[PDB]
Amino acid sequence: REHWATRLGLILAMAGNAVGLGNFLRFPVQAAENGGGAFMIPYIIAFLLVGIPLMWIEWAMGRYGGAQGHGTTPAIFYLLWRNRFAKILGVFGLWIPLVVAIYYVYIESWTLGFAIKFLVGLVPEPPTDPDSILRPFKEFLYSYIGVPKGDEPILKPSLFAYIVFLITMFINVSILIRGISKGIERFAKIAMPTLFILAVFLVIRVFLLETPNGTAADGLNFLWTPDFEKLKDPGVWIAAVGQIFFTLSLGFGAIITYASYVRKDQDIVLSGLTAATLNEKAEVILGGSISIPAAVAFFGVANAVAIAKAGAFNLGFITLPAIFSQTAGGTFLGFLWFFLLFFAGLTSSIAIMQPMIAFLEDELKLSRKHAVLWTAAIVFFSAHLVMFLNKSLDEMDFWAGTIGVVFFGLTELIIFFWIFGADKAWEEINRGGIIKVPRIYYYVMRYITPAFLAVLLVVWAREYIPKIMEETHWTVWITRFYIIGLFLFLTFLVFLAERRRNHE
Amino acid sequence: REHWATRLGLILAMAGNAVGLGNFLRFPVQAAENGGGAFMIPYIIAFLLVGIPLMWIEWAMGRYGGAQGHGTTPAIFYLLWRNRFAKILGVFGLWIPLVVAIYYVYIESWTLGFAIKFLVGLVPEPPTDPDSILRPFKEFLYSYIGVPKGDEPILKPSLFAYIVFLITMFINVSILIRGISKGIERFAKIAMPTLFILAVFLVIRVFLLETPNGTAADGLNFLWTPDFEKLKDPGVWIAAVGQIFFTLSLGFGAIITYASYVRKDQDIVLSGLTAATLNEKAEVILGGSISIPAAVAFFGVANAVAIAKAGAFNLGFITLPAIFSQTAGGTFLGFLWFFLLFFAGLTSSIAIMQPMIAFLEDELKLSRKHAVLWTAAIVFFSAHLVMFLNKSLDEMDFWAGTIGVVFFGLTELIIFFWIFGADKAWEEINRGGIIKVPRIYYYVMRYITPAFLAVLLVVWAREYIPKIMEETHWTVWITRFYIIGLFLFLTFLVFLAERRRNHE
Ligand SMILES: CCCCCCCCO[C@@H]1O[C@H](CO)[C@@H](O)[C@H](O)[C@@H]1O
Ligand SMILES: CCCCCCCCO[C@@H]1O[C@H](CO)[C@@H](O)[C@H](O)[C@@H]1O
Ligand SMILES: CCCCCCCCO[C@@H]1O[C@H](CO)[C@@H](O)[C@H](O)[C@@H]1O
Ligand SMILES: CCCCCCCCO[C@@H]1O[C@H](CO)[C@@H](O)[C@H](O)[C@@H]1O
Ligand SMILES: CCCCCCCCO[C@@H]1O[C@H](CO)[C@@H](O)[C@H](O)[C@@H]1O
Ligand SMILES: CCCCCCCCO[C@@H]1O[C@H](CO)[C@@H](O)[C@H](O)[C@@H]1O
Ligand SMILES: CCCCCCCCO[C@@H]1O[C@H](CO)[C@@H](O)[C@H](O)[C@@H]1O
Ligand SMILES: CCCCCCCCO[C@@H]1O[C@H](CO)[C@@H](O)[C@H](O)[C@@H]1O
Ligand SMILES: CCCCCCCCO[C@@H]1O[C@H](CO)[C@@H](O)[C@H](O)[C@@H]1O
Ligand SMILES: CCCCCCCCO[C@@H]1O[C@H](CO)[C@@H](O)[C@H](O)[C@@H]1O
Ligand SMILES: CCCCCCCCO[C@@H]1O[C@H](CO)[C@@H](O)[C@H](O)[C@@H]1O
Ligand SMILES: CCCCCCCCO[C@@H]1O[C@H](CO)[C@@H](O)[C@H](O)[C@@H]1O
Ligand SMILES: CCCCCCCCO[C@@H]1O[C@H](CO)[C@@H](O)[C@H](O)[C@@H]1O
Ligand SMILES: CCCCCCCCO[C@@H]1O[C@H](CO)[C@@H](O)[C@H](O)[C@@H]1O
Ligand SMILES: N[C@@H](Cc1c[nH]c2ccccc12)C(=O)O
Ligand SMILES: N[C@@H](Cc1c[nH]c2ccccc12)C(=O)O
Ligand SMILES: N[C@@H](Cc1c[nH]c2ccccc12)C(=O)O
Ligand SMILES: N[C@@H](Cc1c[nH]c2ccccc12)C(=O)O
Ligand SMILES: N[C@@H](Cc1c[nH]c2ccccc12)C(=O)O
Ligand SMILES: N[C@@H](Cc1c[nH]c2ccccc12)C(=O)O
Ligand SMILES: N[C@@H](Cc1c[nH]c2ccccc12)C(=O)O
Ligand SMILES: N[C@@H](Cc1c[nH]c2ccccc12)C(=O)O
Ligand SMILES: CCCCCCCCCCCCCC
Ligand SMILES: CCCCCCCCCCCCCC
Ligand code: NA
Ligand code: NA
Ligand code: NA
Ligand code: NA
């Protein structure tokens, strides 16, 4: 089996899996909407009670499977629970990252396309008032993605956008096809420092911004002043737990597969902790310091709230571009910003594609080249639904990317700490640990973490699924049909894997 | 390898593959529209110059592949032409019957649902004038299939319709899962005589029909009086060649796979000829005598033309039901009519599903039970697009079922008689023949048949594809996407097959 070459490379790859667009766009928007500085209360709590515990568990599951030649959950789940239903639940854990890859690489491609456009200065140039600066950037984005101009939910990406998607897939493939140590690890070692450098440069540049409407300080102010009254609200705790889940990429399958290239007794306790901490620093220190402070410096605390409510995507792809178009050196700054996002996405998309690659390798015994190419083929083909059908992305992100991962995380907790055995689980996590998990986490993992996740899944799912099932356009069924198809396809491959195994 | 048990069973199964709804609905409509009695000119010509020749070729290809353990075209094409592109063209020949199965079994289910409804008398009862009798039957059908009432191209089959689809799949599976001799062959031996009996009873009953508007004789009159002027028209020759292709099920893959269970030196010349002749008798004698004569007896030669133009589907599923609702014993007659159609479809759907079954068996070494069940799973799942998306059926029938098969037939001609070798082809067809193919067919096969097909593909494709590509609703892309996906899926399975082979 492939293995990480260095401790540092492992950790930077795992950190790269976690550090994505969310660090710089989602966290700051969720913190601003869910109590500002107060949000660090439920956020730090979620980190300690859900994020850390589940992260170690996923590392443990992957290292465990890896020792037996298995990096994906159909096989691993079955190893933890020798039952046909385990294999099936396991399929769900491979379907998630496949479906996510199918929209995420396209999202990633947009950051590359915008970096290129911003680098060469092929961007809009306004001219006044807020909407007069935003609209040209909204149009710029809408033209790139091909947002429907009419009543058909059909998208039409620009040719440039499509070609950039091809290039982005190519770049992912170039990395992946070199494998774990010479591809992913090697890339992480360049990518994480680059990312760090860009983010710091960005934070500095941002902190200098002054306009008649305000300064970067005003932005930090608005972002971080506590609103302790929002803690009363239950949706703030859901937001925090969800933000932790998303930021650490839990339940998505990448951690498990990456951890499957960690050696049998090689530490995961400290390595996992260190990768999580890197993500948290990039998230709260860097991400907390760029996008919102810029937007508030430029638009002023007067529009802070409306800006936060308009969301992470508008913030990263319309509002900041616009702000860059109005500040000194801003076009080049825009390139730096999108370059940052691109490496942030790229370090995660290689991670999210590796599980399908591992599966084909481990279970169907494809060569790495064939596994990477067929995985790229499936993702590339599939992504055409996402590129051309409006809201397809959203439906995949919901069922696989959201409901899916949280339910799957809960499943991970139960299979590992309850079915496999709480004491076996504990020993599996701690074996070879450079440091040991505090004994108190045994109870957190067995009782607290699953309870938490059970609430996130439940209290929340009641408040989401009915809307998605009832208030959506009929075309959602197209995406549902297709991804259910993908689930059936994976079930079939697992069936073939087990037939191939019985033969040999 | 499985083999047919009896000569008779082989022939009745192959005849059952050919004899379908077309015999009783399409042929009579095409003959009435393309010269009446005159139509037998280009029709008999097509039979001799395209239908017979290509049929023998497909039998020869399947028997040939069968001797080497291969019943489907990815493997067989490669055996005839050891080139990667051969395998790929071969994939197309397995994709066709998979896609066709995916809509055809649903069409079949409708005949079963209507037979049941008509048997128990749960049908509409009009009351006057033509539309006043038809409309309740149009509505009856529209309610069953769930034709869109609004502007969304969404279908909503009745629950009854859906359940009947489940039953129909079950019935197909029950037959298929018993395999070639104990399932398909055994069923053919009951089904073909039953079919013959129903058709004869129907012809007799129909010939007795008298109304103030006319008699069955008037119907035969209108149907068979020649219009030799239409032969001038090129589209009449296309219609005839196409009708022959469709009636004999050529290019669809079922003949090749069925023939793969014929023993290495067991005759195919006379057996193939005999199965074709059975289809022709059922088509021109029986099919020519029922549907149109009934419709004209009842509605009168005054509306003969308009009725023919309204098409085979309206004829079989609306107009005849209605006519049955106005004649003595007509409800029970309606049951007999739909029972006839059901067995006609059922004997063909088992044939069209066998290629995917053979592939999984021959190439992935699945057991017959697993191959049948997974094939049923894929067809069942896939059919939901056909059941719920308006015009999906039509798009599949076009690309796979129409363009597909004719192009594939041409491909068969070229690979066999040109690439494999015209003399090797000839010997392959004739080996073990009870009778020998007339020497003159050597030239027909090498020059005439491919020319014919090249024209059907070309002259016609110019006149069809632009309309389908330009004048269709955007939702066609959903079906295109999906069936291209199916093509990619099959390519992947072939890839796995060849990897499994290299390993063993
Ligand atoms: C290989 C998968 C086939 C599915 C059909 C998708 C073909 C993509 O088509 C492409 O779309 C681009 C972006 O809209 C256009 O700019 C280009 O003209 C190109 O035709
Ligand atoms: C490395 C230098 C090459 C970069 C050139 C590729 C970008 C060209 O992109 C162009 O941008 C224009 C302005 O937004 C658009 O109007 C055009 O549709 C086009 O996509
Ligand atoms: C390095 C990647 C950047 C190169 C991608 C450039 C492709 C965009 O080229 C585009 O072609 C379209 C069709 O002719 C034009 O309408 C656009 O204006 C644009 O020039
Ligand atoms: C993006 C890379 C080049 C940008 C370099 C310009 C950084 C200086 O930035 C400037 O700082 C001034 C105070 O010193 C402020 O009044 C202005 O907001 C201005 O942006
Ligand atoms: C969901 C799978 C993607 C399907 C949509 C991508 C291809 C759409 O392409 C479409 O083709 C039509 C017919 O040639 C053209 O008339 C349209 O302009 C459009 O380019
Ligand atoms: C079982 C899944 C629990 C998820 C809890 C946190 C999810 C909150 O994220 C939510 O996702 C929704 C659907 O994707 C979006 O429409 C909302 O805007 C929101 O961001
Ligand atoms: C490709 C075939 C699509 C058929 C879709 C038929 C079902 C239409 O139902 C649709 O379902 C949505 C999602 O639950 C709901 O928001 C609405 O009820 C909508 O009408
Ligand atoms: C197993 C494949 C899942 C795809 C969703 C299709 C579920 C079919 O749903 C069924 O449709 C019938 C016919 O319209 C309805 O009468 C029934 O209520 C039933 O819900
Ligand atoms: C073997 C006896 C059982 C046959 C009963 C099943 C048929 C019931 O079918 C019924 O037909 C009605 C009249 O068309 C419809 O209005 C109902 O929706 C229903 O589908
Ligand atoms: C042997 C196969 C025939 C049995 C199928 C009968 C299923 C149709 O049953 C249907 O249920 C619907 C939902 O409650 C009703 O609206 C219809 O009127 C009908 O009764
Ligand atoms: C469908 C099975 C039962 C049908 C039996 C009735 C057959 C007799 O049919 C009758 O023949 C008469 C002349 O003899 C005609 O005038 C009428 O059209 C009538 O249909
Ligand atoms: C192309 C794959 C088939 C998808 C369509 C079959 C399922 C459509 O079912 C739909 O579900 C909606 C949400 O629950 C309901 O509101 C609608 O009434 C409808 O039944
Ligand atoms: C390469 C394929 C050649 C086909 C020649 C005969 C086909 C004539 O059949 C045609 O099929 C069309 C599309 O399915 C239908 O829309 C027309 O009504 C017509 O029946
Ligand atoms: C599921 C995603 C569907 C995206 C479809 C986008 C292409 C829309 O183009 C469509 O193509 C049809 C067939 O060629 C043509 O009849 C029309 O040009 C139609 O507009
Ligand atoms: N961790 C990423 C988000 C993420 C979760 N799961 C993923 C899977 C693939 C790519 C990204 C992700 C971020 O904070 O931005
Ligand atoms: N219109 C912005 C949000 C917004 C509202 N008011 C503002 C004032 C300033 C800047 C942005 C805003 C968007 O949807 O993306
Ligand atoms: N659906 C979320 C993003 C997301 C994906 N997976 C998640 C898991 C947990 C929380 C959020 C997410 C959004 O659109 O904002
Ligand atoms: N568990 C110890 C020692 C160890 C065991 N196997 C390893 C493989 C690689 C590196 C270290 C180790 C550690 O991680 O440090
Ligand atoms: N031979 C059938 C039509 C047909 C052609 N190919 C098929 C494939 C499956 C089922 C039926 C068919 C008929 O005349 O009615
Ligand atoms: N309206 C019938 C065809 C038709 C036209 N005129 C007629 C007169 C009598 C019977 C049928 C017809 C259909 O579309 O199905
Ligand atoms: N598409 C034809 C039926 C058909 C399917 N395959 C064919 C091959 C040849 C001729 C006709 C067909 C129709 O709707 O009428
Ligand atoms: N070719 C001869 C004899 C023959 C060879 N192999 C066979 C297998 C089965 C039946 C007959 C045969 C025939 O078909 O009659
Ligand atoms: C697995 C990734 C899901 C995407 C969630 C959003 C992340 C924050 C940046 C906004 C851009 C995303 C486009 C919908
Ligand atoms: C392979 C079968 C294709 C269907 C062609 C039509 C056959 C004649 C009867 C009409 C009913 C079919 C519903 C579209
Ligand atoms: Na993160
Ligand atoms: Na990343
Ligand atoms: Na036929
Ligand atoms: Na048949």
Explain this structure to me?
The structure is a homodimer of 504-residue chains. By secondary structure, chain A is mostly helical. Chain A has one domain. Chain A is built from 23 helices and two strands. Chain A has helices at 7-18, 21-24, 26-33, 40-67, 73-80, 84-120, 130-145, 159-176, 179-208, 216-224, 234-247, 254-259, 269-287, 291-299, 304-309, 312-324, 330-364, 368-388, 392-420, 422-430, 441-462, 465-470, 476-503; strands spanning 210-211, 214-215. In chain A, strands 1-2 form a two-stranded antiparallel sheet. In chain A, helix 4 (40-67) runs parallel beside helix 11, helix 6 (84-120) crosses helix 19 and helix 8 (159-176) packs antiparallel against helix 18. The longest helix of chain A is centred in the first third of the chain and has 37 residues, at 84-120. In chain A, 55% of the residues are buried. The A-B interface holds A 152, 154, 364-366, 370, 374, 377-378, 381, 384-385, 388, 474, 477-478, 481-482, 484-485, 488-489, 492, 495-496, 499-500, 503 and B 152, 154, 364-366, 370, 374, 377-378, 381, 384-385, 388, 474, 477-478, 481-482, 484-485, 488-489, 492, 495-496, 499-500, 503. One octyl beta-D-glucopyranoside sits between chains A (384-385, 388-389) and B (469, 477, 481). It is classed as transport protein. The entry lists the keywords SLC6, NSS, transmembrane, sodium-coupled, transporter, Symport, transport protein.
